Design an enzyme around this catalytic site. Structure first.
Site, PDB file in Angstrom:
ATOM      1  N   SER A 249      -5.464   8.059   5.573  1.00 42.30           N
ATOM      2  CA  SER A 249      -4.623   7.197   4.762  1.00 42.30           C
ATOM      3  C   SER A 249      -3.564   7.989   4.057  1.00 42.30           C
ATOM      4  O   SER A 249      -3.810   9.060   3.528  1.00 42.30           O
ATOM      5  CB  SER A 249      -5.442   6.386   3.767  1.00 42.30           C
ATOM      6  OG  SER A 249      -6.367   5.493   4.363  1.00 42.30           O
TER       7      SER A 249
ATOM      8  N   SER B 234      -2.187   2.919   6.256  1.00 38.79           N
ATOM      9  CA  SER B 234      -3.006   2.103   5.318  1.00 38.79           C
ATOM     10  C   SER B 234      -4.449   1.966   5.762  1.00 38.79           C
ATOM     11  O   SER B 234      -5.366   2.351   5.012  1.00 38.79           O
ATOM     12  CB  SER B 234      -2.342   0.740   5.073  1.00 38.79           C
ATOM     13  OG  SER B 234      -3.094  -0.094   4.252  1.00 38.79           O
TER      14      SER B 234
ATOM     15  N   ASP C  64       0.897  -1.214   0.000  1.00 42.10           N
ATOM     16  CA  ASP C  64       0.000   0.000   0.000  1.00 42.10           C
ATOM     17  C   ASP C  64       0.900   1.218   0.000  1.00 42.10           C
ATOM     18  O   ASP C  64       0.989   1.965   1.012  1.00 42.10           O
ATOM     19  CB  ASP C  64      -0.989  -0.010   1.166  1.00 42.10           C
ATOM     20  CG  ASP C  64      -2.148   0.951   0.973  1.00 42.10           C
ATOM     21  OD1 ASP C  64      -2.133   1.682  -0.016  1.00 42.10           O
ATOM     22  OD2 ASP C  64      -3.099   0.913   1.807  1.00 42.10           O
TER      23      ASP C  64
END
Ligand SMILES: [Cl-]
Ligand SMILES: [Cl-]
Ligand SMILES: [Cl-]
Ligand SMILES: [Cl-]
EC number: 3.4.21.81
Lengths: 4, 185, 185, 4
Positions: free
Chosen positions: C141, C156, C63
């Protein structure tokens, strides 16, 4: 509305 | 410890509003719905670094309270984020304002209405509130609303959240300063 | 603009992770699930102050992603809150860590597990994640996880929230730095 | 868990  | 930081009671967490003085005596303001049920305040979630004791609380009708410091050595900063806060002012519609609190940190917006009445339910109605398009979330109560070097308000409550947006109402600070005979710094 | 600040795509908001360089070229890292569906990034909710264009995205499995700055005059700060960030390190269990993001601001805790696998549903599984007891909420995020002057991770996902607590997982930053041949500052 |  609501208290924080 | 500074405006917007966490404060802990025996039951939960709120935010410090502003640090204030009368002469050489130090206090902090927070929300009245926080001081109503809490005598001792701590700086840490472990409830071992004492801040002080509630000395005044006004909620509902208003939403403000005051805690006198008993911890003589903890720093009592006079800035919010990097901003000095040296005076208080009344809100005006359209004024640009920033809030800090211990759940969501620092968020900004505008004053959208004055003298709002906010019903929290259960008999707890507050009057005279500043309405804004700033978001807030549980734990943010009591934290400062400011504009440049001017204290404007103390976080009371609202709707929405900081992911999708919200509406937050603030107790004007000037009424607390007058009630308690203190000055922000 | 600095780590933890809002970044806006055409569809929504994430947070800037770290500002990074390769020579004289500036970029920022964020979450791969943010760059996957977004080419242009803006600094403001009005979508008129362009930041730059996505140049790399890795999500799911990892991610992380990267956006190259095209706005030559915007400040690209090298600090997170007041903290300089000059190197990257691997997480270790028990390490003290701080996250910043644009929904919830700055929150701290510990690393509680390494190499976690996190299933977001719908085929989106991420591996290799740092688990922590730090809270986060939607919009956070991509924001930085740091420890002193060391970059550790990129926000994440997770569970819970910053009112009652949570668990948040981070992509280790070192893998993004290596993939993209850049260095944090 | 959910992405943020
Ligand atoms: Cl608590
Ligand atoms: Cl409004
Ligand atoms: Cl948006
Ligand atoms: Cl955990």
């Amino acid at each position: 509305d609501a208290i924080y | 410890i500074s405006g917007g930081d966490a404060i802990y009671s025996s039951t939960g967490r709120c935010s410090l509003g502003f640090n204030v003085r009368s002469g050489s005596t130090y206090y902090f303001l927070t929300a009245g719905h926080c001081t109503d049920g809490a005598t001792t305040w701590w700086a840490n979630s472990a409830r071992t670094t004492v801040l002080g004791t509630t000395s005044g609380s006004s909620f509902p009708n208003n939403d403000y309270g005051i805690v006198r410091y008993t911890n003589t050595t903890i720093p009592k900063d006079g800035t919010v984020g990097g901003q000095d806060i040296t005076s208080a002012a009344n809100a005006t519609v359209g004024m640009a304002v920033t809030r800090r609190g211990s759940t969501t940190g620092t968020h900004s917006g505008s004053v959208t209405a004055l003298n709002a009445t906010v019903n929290y339910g259960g008999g707890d109605v507050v009057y005279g509130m500043i309405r804004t398009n700033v978001c807030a979330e549980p734990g943010d109560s009591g934290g400062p609303l400011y504009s440049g070097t001017r204290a404007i308000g103390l976080t009371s409550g609202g709707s929405g959240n900081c992911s999708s947006g919200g509406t937050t109402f603030f107790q004007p600070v000037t009424e607390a300063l007058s009630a308690y005979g203190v000055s922000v710094y």
